Write a protein that binds this ligand. Sequence first.
Ligand code: HEM
Ligand code: HEM
Lengths: 145, 145
Amino acid sequence: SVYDAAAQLTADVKKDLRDSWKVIGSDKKGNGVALMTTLFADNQETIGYFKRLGDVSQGMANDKLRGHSITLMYALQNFIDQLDNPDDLVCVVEKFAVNHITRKISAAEFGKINGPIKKVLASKNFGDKYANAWAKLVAVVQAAL
Amino acid sequence: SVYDAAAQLTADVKKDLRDSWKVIGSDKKGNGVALMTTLFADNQETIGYFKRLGDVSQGMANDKLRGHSITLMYALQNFIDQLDNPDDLVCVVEKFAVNHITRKISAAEFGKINGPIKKVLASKNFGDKYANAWAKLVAVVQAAL
Ligand code: HEM
Ligand code: HEM
């Protein structure tokens, strides 16, 4: 239940999401591409889904990948801005869920993003505490897949 | 090319885009829904394209329409943030262009958004100069369609 999942976002979780986002969200192009490349590097079996982006091993040099990455960061920006209103958070989450449901992405495979997120956060000096906070936001999306 | 259209946006145009977005963009849910509803009111022929959103006459009450509207405003947020780097603006514009190319939206049909934009701008007292500034940003997307 996406609604029960959203209720898991307590005051402490929301604060950690915001604090960490202020830092990582300041460089959407850099951190966005880092997130994606890390995903492809640690989970090669997911690369097939991104056929449209071309050669993802080119990283920042790949225009399609860069465009994709930046846009992805704005989806997270959307989520963060909706934290005060669970009804609005839910409707945007379900909107992006659809984009993945059509791509045949399951809740389990969507969860493979948690590894990359922890690594990107770690490189910015944010530990498990912040990684666990984001796992909870990711869980809201998973509940809608 | 799309780059040509992007690279043309002058300092004065970027200024009007940013000043108007500061206001309109501060209420993404309210202004995004008004933009969509205005499009359906003045161009009823486009209603058919949004069948996934259900009953669009429901306005704010329609969760799917609300989620779509908020998300559309973040695509604009994305554009606004990439203004000083044509290379990044282009790759994100092309990304969203694919989203519409897939729905068989022509450059002409996409330009229908200009009327609604003008009205939303006017409701906040932003005149023709600002509407023309936005028509120029829309043209960047049209160059990709
Ligand atoms: C932090 C979590 C994630 C967010 C916020 C996110 C966001 C997005 C966004 C905004 C798009 C563009 C939607 C569209 O225009 O159709 C997208 C596309 C896509 N996503 Fe995700 N995504 C996430 C995780 C994942 C994961 C883990 C997978 C794969 C295991 C995945 C697979 C896809 C695929 C296949 C596409 C289509 C790419 C294309 O053809 O352009 N996403 N995602
Ligand atoms: C300022 C201009 C506009 C922007 C920034 C914009 C942005 C967006 C975004 C972000 C999506 C979601 C893409 C996806 O997840 O697949 C979308 C979908 C769509 N757009 Fe636009 N759009 C604009 C104007 C228009 C206009 C004028 C039309 C056609 C008359 C149009 C028709 C569509 C359709 C049919 C969809 C699919 C909706 C669905 O089934 O979910 N768009 N647009």
